[PDB]
């Protein structure tokens, strides 16, 4: 499942993914963490809350 990227969000710690409105984060799974998803960007995982974000259908 990939998501496209709807807002600007910024990394605060390494474990999380610096991301660009237009971005295509790929291979996106569900964390315990409510309002968090990880996935994959330009070669690098990382997680991100899913409100900047949208699924592809
Ligand atoms: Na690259």
């Known amino acids: 499942v ?7 969000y910024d990394a ?5 993914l610096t991301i660009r409105v237009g971005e295509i984060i790929r ?3 569900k964390l315990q ?7 994959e960007l330009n070669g690098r995982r ?3 809350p899913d ?3 949208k699924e592809i259908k």
Not at 2 to 8: H, L, P, R
């Open 46 to 48: 990382g997680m991100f």
């Open 12 to 16: 605060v710690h390494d474990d999380e």
């Open 51 to 53: 409100n900047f974000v």
């Open 27 to 29: 291979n996106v799974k």
């Open 33 to 39: 963490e409510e309002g968090w998803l990880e996935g």
């Open 2 to 8: 990939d998501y496209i990227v709807e807002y600007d």
